[PDB]
């Protein structure tokens, strides 16, 4: 991985040593060439995972996530380029640096071979992210969103640090391969029940699980565009990636300890989906859409079946590209009228016919139209959840109906009806804004033709 | 004060801890504690106004009373064993009275109420001395008798200090109090691990010193005592915001900064001894430190508070501070986690 | 009231540069920034990255495992063996508790 990491560490000197008129071109050119090199990880001709050293190693779970991270860096640079044009030079280079730093840590976070190394990297991402939301956010509420984001994570993460230390003080190591090949069944004593929650609540908060999710709609609604893109596409998947990795050493307590969290996800996802029907803020509607998709990911990981893992991995990558595409699209309006209210601007298909096509395709991905990989996830999670118990189809049936309503209601409200003709500042879509959407959508279409690449570990 | 006084007074301040640290006999260890107490007093009260006089008085009566209690332990022990050093056979109550007295000298809660006020009434550079160099002498005594210390007293003091330091610092708009409560909380970590691994108490002391030194130096750059005073740094020394923020996160124990290492290794070693409950509460209340450190970061580097007209003159002028030590201590106190295995052992 | 700038106004990005691409206020820096994104983004990554992924062979043994299953399903059918045994590990090697 040191050939994906070291060149990425060089985008930091390149950011600072480049000319004022070359920073945005140079960095965004080399970010693409770094996401090309990360494709080497996909050269997996065998059933043995790639182990590069004692530190890093790539699996079929950590490779899609690694690549999605590297590909997202150039996307976020282009997204952040028009709302930073009024800042002096050092602020732009300081913004570019915080985004690169978040790509370097995220790649190391998914490639780490030891839990303690995962934890530290998994905590370091708060710094660049807290700086982004707070320094470059727009409203006065960005200060309260940084606190909610920082201390939901930290409160959950202290018990995880405790539990990880107990694992090593007993097993001798935190290496993920060794803990896999030497795992011993846990007793059902009241101490291991707490060890289970200690190892899980950190990741269940980051998903977020229903109940403890109020940090996400606060963070999204106030972060700059690249703050929402990375949050909705990668940082939520730190929770999912962690739970998959550490749940191997927690058996058999997941057969009963998971009930409270399968129930909060299955019921919680209906509560969040139905919120999107009455949400007056467009950036808020998407953020609750994320909460209700991650609910299925939580539910499917808690049952540990080959299908459920397979559906969750596909839904992790699919949601990564889709939610990011939605946030970019909502930003495109926001960078014209500087209002997040969904009903303020209407009939935008009349003056942005092409941007209205991307809206439709993003919206169709969100409501999981076959054959997109958004459905494959939803469909394979449903299949596994049905086998787990047959009445989960009742709640997933409902959530599928609501998911259609708020997806199309989102499209019908903003793109149709009459134009809000007083908006004389609706400039034609930039070539930059359209490229940003094509870069989200083309990979999503390509991954549908080759789903094998995002089946995860079980398949 | 004239150069003769500084040479005499600053030498004596330095001399005290070196006598306590190099001494085999307990009475010579006590003597070094007296040198520090006596010689710091003129430094604290140099500006001579109503507040530094109260500060130098509260400090004297606290540290003199604690000295007498320590001396009683040293003397009851000479009665019991005819020797000038603590032995495995030293009475249990003799050791506990030494612990409470030394914690009274360190500022550990619940014997802590003096420290935030004294730090408040004195100039910044003497707060630096008081919150750093002055802690080594009492701590060096404690590390010499760690096989003997009752852990129940030590953990109740450490748990108290971590809680009171967190709660106290959460309510403060004065920077000097925020530094005192910061000190109280960190001493809780040094003390909690003392009877188990005294080497980790020295690691946590050293990392705290190199974080607390530049932080004071940063406030001494513009002589900024309040949260509103430090909020003007963007319009006074904006070059300082990058390293003030990291040092504050580093003082907060956030990864991947050097200040995570002390908490992380202390927790690790506490649970090697099965000190699960204490370790969990300690780490859970260290979260409160990060909140009011975060609030400071909000006011200085992540937002721009309103500035005043007269600050434009300040910009026309040229500063000769900080010195080369600030930069060296700022980098080492934040970017040295990848050297963790070389610091613990 | 306090000294404070008034809020900057609503500028048209196309007013001065009708070919504004969205990247920069300077036309020459602006076009070369659009060109770079299209070249490294579409001509290089999407084209070659897609090609390199289509010619990764025997991906995760999806191809070897089929070739091997056909070899086994043949060998076992002619030699009269079961297509697949109920037990995975031979019962000989497993010493059960008594």
């Amino acid at each position: 991985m040191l050939k994906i990491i070291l060149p990425s560490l060089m985008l930091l000197p390149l950011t600072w040593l480049s000319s004022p008129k070359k920073t945005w071109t140079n960095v965004t050119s080399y970010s693409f060439l770094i996401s090309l090199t990360s494709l080497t990880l996909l050269w997996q001709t065998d059933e043995n995972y790639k182990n590069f050293s004692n530190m890093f190693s790539s699996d079929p779970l950590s490779t899609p996530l690694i690549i999605l991270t590297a590909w997202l860096l150039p996307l976020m640079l282009m997204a952040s380029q028009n709302h930073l044009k009024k800042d002096n030079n050092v602020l732009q280079k300081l913004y570019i640096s915080m985004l690169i730093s978040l790509q370097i840590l995220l790649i190391m976070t998914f490639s780490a071979t030891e839990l303690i190394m995962f934890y530290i990297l998994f905590e370091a991402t708060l710094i660049p992210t807290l700086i982004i939301i707070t320094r470059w956010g727009n409203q006065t509420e960005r200060l309260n969103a940084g606190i909610y984001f920082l201390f939901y994570t930290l409160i959950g993460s202290i018990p995880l640090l405790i539990a990880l230390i107990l694992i090593q003080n007993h097993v001798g190591t935190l290496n993920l391969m060794i803990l896999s090949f030497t795992t011993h069944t846990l007793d059902a004593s009241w101490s291991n029940n707490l060890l289970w929650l200690a190892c899980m609540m950190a990741f269940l908060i980051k998903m977020p699980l229903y109940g403890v999710h109020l940090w996400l709609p606060k963070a999204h609604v106030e972060a700059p565009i690249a703050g929402s893109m990375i949050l909705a596409a990668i940082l939520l998947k730190l929770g999912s990636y962690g739970m998959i990795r550490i749940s191997i050493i927690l058996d058999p307590l997941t057969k009963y300890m998971a009930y409270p969290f399968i129930l909060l996800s299955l019921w919680g996802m209906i509560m969040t989906s139905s919120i999107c029907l009455r949400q007056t803020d467009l950036k808020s509607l998407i953020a609750y859409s994320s909460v209700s998709h991650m609910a299925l990911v939580i539910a499917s990981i808690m049952i540990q079946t080959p299908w459920s893992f397979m559906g969750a991995t596909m839904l992790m990558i699919a949601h990564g590209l889709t939610s990011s595409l939605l946030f970019c699209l909502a930003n495109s309006n926001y960078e014209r009228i500087h209002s997040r209210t969904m009903i303020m601007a209407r009939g935008l298909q009349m003056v942005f016919p092409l941007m209205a096509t991307w809206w439709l395709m993003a919206s169709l991905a969100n409501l999981a139209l076959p054959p997109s990989i958004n459905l494959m996830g939803e469909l394979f999670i449903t299949m596994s959840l049905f086998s787990w118990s047959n009445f989960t189809i009742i709640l997933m049936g409902i959530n599928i109906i609501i998911t259609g309503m708020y997806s199309m209601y989102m499209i019908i409200t903003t793109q149709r009806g009459k134009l809000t003709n007083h908006m004389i500042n609706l400039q034609p879509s930039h070539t930059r804004e359209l490229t940003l959407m094509a870069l989200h959508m083309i990979p999503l279409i390509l991954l549908t033709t080759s789903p094998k690449l995002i089946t995860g570990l079980t398949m | 004060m004239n150069p003769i006084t500084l040479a005499i007074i600053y030498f004596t301040i330095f001399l005290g801890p070196v006598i306590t640290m190099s001494s085999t006999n307990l009475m010579l260890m006590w003597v070094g504690l007296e040198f520090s107490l006596l010689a710091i007093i003129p430094m604290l009260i140099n500006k001579k106004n109503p507040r530094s006089t109260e500060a130098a008085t509260k400090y004297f009566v606290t540290q003199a009373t604690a000295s007498m209690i320590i001396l009683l332990a040293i003397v009851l022990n000479y009665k019991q064993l005819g020797t000038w050093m603590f032995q495995q056979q030293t009475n249990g109550l003799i050791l506990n009275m030494t612990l409470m007295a030394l914690s009274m000298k360190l500022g550990l809660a619940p014997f802590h109420f003096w420290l935030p006020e004294v730090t408040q009434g004195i100039p910044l550079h003497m707060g630096l001395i008081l919150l750093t160099w002055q802690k080594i002498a009492p701590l060096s005594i404690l590390i010499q008798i760690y096989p003997l210390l009752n852990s129940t007293i030590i953990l109740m003091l450490a748990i108290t200090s971590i809680f009171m330091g967190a709660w106290g610092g959460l309510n403060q708009t004065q920077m000097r109090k925020i530094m005192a409560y910061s000190s109280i909380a960190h001493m809780g970590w040094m003390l909690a691990i003392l009877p188990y691994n005294p080497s980790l108490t020295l690691l946590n002391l050293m990392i705290y010193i190199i974080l607390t030194a530049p932080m004071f130096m940063a406030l001494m750059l513009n002589n900024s005592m309040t949260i509103n005073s430090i909020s003007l740094l963007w319009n006074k020394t904006p070059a300082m915001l990058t390293m003030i923020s990291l040092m504050l996160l580093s003082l907060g124990g956030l990864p991947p900064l050097t200040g995570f290492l002390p908490k992380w290794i202390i927790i690790t070693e506490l649970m090697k001894n099965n000190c699960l409950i204490m370790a969990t509460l300690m780490a859970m209340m260290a979260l409160l430190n990060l909140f009011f450190y975060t609030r400071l970061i909000y006011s200085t580097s992540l937002t721009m508070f309103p500035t005043n007209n007269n600050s434009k003159m300040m910009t026309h002028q040229t500063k000769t501070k900080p010195n080369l030590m600030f930069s060296t201590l700022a980098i080492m106190s934040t970017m040295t986690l990848p050297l963790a295995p070389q610091l613990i052992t | 009231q306090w000294q404070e700038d008034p809020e900057p106004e609503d500028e048209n990005v196309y007013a001065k540069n009708p070919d504004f691409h969205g990247y920069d206020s300077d036309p020459v820096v602006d076009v070369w920034n659009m060109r770079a994104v299209f070249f490294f983004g579409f001509s290089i990554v999407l084209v070659f990255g897609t090609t390199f992924v289509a010619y990764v062979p025997d991906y995760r043994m999806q191809e070897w495992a089929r070739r091997e299953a056909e070899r086994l399903v043949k060998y076992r059918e002619v030699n009269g063996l079961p297509i697949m045994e109920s037990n995975y590990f031979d019962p000989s090697k497993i010493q059960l508790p008594e």
């Binding site: 956010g137 409203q139 | 403060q172 | 306090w2």
Partner: peptide, 19 residues
């Protein structure tokens, strides 16, 4: 719109003796 930056009312909440 423009980025919100603290005003006089916001800063006066750190101006007291306690927080």
């Amino acid at each position: 719109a423009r980025q919100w930056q603290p005003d006089i009312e916001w800063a006066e909440q750190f101006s007291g003796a306690v927080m």
